[PDB]
Write a protein that binds this ligand. Structure first.
Ligand SMILES: Nc1ncnc2c1ncn2[C@@H]1O[C@H](COP(=O)(O)O)[C@@H](O)[C@H]1O
Ligand SMILES: Nc1ncnc2c1ncn2[C@@H]1O[C@H](COP(=O)(O)O)[C@@H](O)[C@H]1O
Ligand SMILES: [Zn+2]
Ligand SMILES: [Zn+2]
Ligand SMILES: [Zn+2]
Ligand SMILES: [Zn+2]
Lengths: 311, 305
């Protein structure tokens, strides 16, 4: 049954028009990121344990940054200023994040936080995007496990689009769209402080939003318990995806608040984590319209992910 | 070199600039029609010996039956496939400009038919060739998708240009030669590199005059464009080693009110399917471009065919 849907968090029409059971992936031994080879990496910001030779993760600068941290005093057209950094996820070469315990993932998530705060000290930076790219066509240039963060001198579309949307939904309904998640999105799994769902008007097939059950406008408010919990759920979400979809290239994106949000935006600004398994590409309709075509309804995705067995 | 952000009213979004080096029978075969979804018309009109046909898409993304019905809406819309040549062995651009004229004019004929439906908000026409750019069939061809609402790209375009117009009192597209990097122009267009293009080697073909409506396309301009579109697609393949592509005609919704006409202008966007996308762009909606439009224009101004 083809229809069009819209989520006040993404604010753009997606078409739903397809079987959910047949969707599957179709997309060295050492590296400079490996422990004992830090001399081959760009400058470090910090490493957990705090300044320790037997480290768990490190937060280093990107050797080929997309934005220049040396254009700060210099800010139609603006200068390429930013902080494009890399968070090293494991000292080990070949272990994928989803195979990292949930407590270790919690710590990686705690690093993002600490860095965002370190960055939030720069009045120029207005929004950092914490995102992970695992896989060639999902953009993984390194095989070792890592995630990327970039701090921007502007507020992007989806954000002002998400902020422009959840506010319009709040003004009327009185509620923050994500607080209504279990009643407005399809439930997959739930942890102590988070719940996962196939979004009502999902962009991509098999897309996931791990959503804080409590109302929290900014990611950086991650504590140790929540960081370990969410880790377990993120670990659970990445394993059900890998089994059910045959280890597809996938990336994840943390969505949070503009650095200088308003006291008013808080009641409807609610962060979350989006997981997008790569299962297909686009054509001239999408690039041209900004509207996506999703071949699987979240009604089915939610049934599948619930039926996935992990033993 | 030094990265830089840049915006444009047409896109109304900043892109991250971060820097001639780039590069790379069927059912549609004349004699198998009954094997295609229904026909809306062909050209020559009602000619068994056709040069192009506009048919319904066998696997439509939006159902043309759900018309009666209609944060959510029914999947009503039309989806058609323009078959650009009864010869399985031809590149859209290896085609004669006059014949490209035929196809364009056909888009116009199908839009007017569609415009008769009060339920259609926008009418995007696009071209897919090459696997990586999205294509599933090799025979040369393009498509049309008619929608019940105005999509994301048009939304912003209306906002970006409107706001720009409240500024300098000028339609930015009419100012193409003072805002974009000109590579080439014919008696009616200026294919251009856009000041703040989203994709590397992106090319915009811009009607010189202010035609807030693609469907205002006439015969001489129709073939006037064909020659320039052809020239850009051939220069594209030449310098970039024949990369798949998806060009997109940008134009105006069927409910364009009068207050939006001075600043709404239609243009064609060529995207050699190159650059890849990962989490940054997915989470932000802000693309990164490795090559500035100043370098792309010079490179393409020197292409020899
Ligand atoms: N030796 C290095 N030290 C720090 N960053 C690097 C190094 N080599 C490559 N990189 C970057 O690490 C990132 C990994 O990308 P992946 O995730 O898609 C890329 O953005 C590279 O610019
Ligand atoms: N026999 C057919 N009749 C009408 N449309 C078709 C037929 N076979 C394939 N198509 C459509 O033609 C397009 C060819 O794909 P290409 O462009 O990637 C697709 O959008 C299909 O839905
Ligand atoms: Zn390695
Ligand atoms: Zn909330
Ligand atoms: Zn053919
Ligand atoms: Zn104009």
């Amino acid at each position: 049954s083809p229809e069009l849907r819209k989520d006040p968090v993404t604010n753009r029409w997606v078409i739903f028009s397809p079987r959910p059971t047949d969707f599957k992936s179709k997309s060295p031994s050492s590296c400079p990121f490996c422990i004992g080879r830090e001399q081959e990496c760009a400058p470090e910001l910090f490493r957990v344990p705090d300044h320790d030779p037997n480290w768990k993760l490190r937060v280093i600068e990107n050797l080929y940054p997309a934005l220049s941290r040396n254009l700060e005093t210099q800010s139609r057209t603006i200068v390429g200023f930013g902080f494009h950094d890399v968070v090293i996820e494991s000292p080990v070469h070949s272990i994928q994040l989803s195979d990292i315990d949930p407590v270790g993932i919690g710590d990686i998530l705690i690093a993002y936080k600490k860095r965002i705060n370190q960055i939030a000290q720069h009045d120029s930076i207005n929004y950092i995007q914490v995102f992970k790219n695992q896989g060639a066509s999902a953009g993984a240039s390194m095989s070792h496990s890592h995630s990327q963060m970039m701090a921007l001198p502007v507020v992007p579309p989806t954000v002002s689009s998400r902020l422009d949307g959840t506010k319009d939904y709040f003004e009327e309904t009185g509620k923050c769209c994500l607080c209504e998640a279990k009643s407005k999105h399809f439930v997959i799994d739930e942890s102590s402080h988070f719940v996962s769902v196939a979004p009502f008007a999902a962009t991509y097939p098999f897309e996931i939003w791990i959503i804080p059950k409590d109302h929290s406008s900014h990611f950086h408010h991650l504590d140790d318990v929540k960081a370990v919990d969410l880790g377990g759920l993120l670990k659970l979400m990445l394993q059900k995806i890998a089994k059910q979809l045959n280890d597809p290239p996938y990336n994840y994106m943390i969505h949070t608040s503009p650095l200088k949000v308003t006291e008013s935006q808080l009641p409807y600004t609610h962060w979350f984590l989006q997981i997008v398994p790569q299962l297909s590409g686009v054509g001239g309709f999408e690039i041209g319209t900004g509207c996506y075509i999703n071949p699987v309804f979240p009604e089915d995705v939610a049934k599948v992910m619930r039926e996935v067995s992990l033993t």
